[PDB]
Coordinates of N, CA, C and O and ligand atoms in Angstrom, one line a residue:
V1 N 16.9 8.5 36.0 CA 16.7 7.3 35.2 C 16.1 6.2 36.0 O 16.6 5.9 37.1
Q2 N 15.0 5.6 35.5 CA 14.3 4.5 36.2 C 14.2 3.4 35.1 O 13.6 3.6 34.1
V3 N 14.7 2.2 35.4 CA 14.6 1.0 34.6 C 14.0 -0.1 35.4 O 14.6 -0.5 36.5
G4 N 12.9 -0.7 35.0 CA 12.4 -1.8 35.7 C 11.7 -2.9 34.8 O 11.6 -2.6 33.6
Ligands
NA101 NA1 13.3 9.7 35.8

């Protein structure tokens, strides 16, 4: 998971 990548959130930016
Ligand atoms: Na990912």
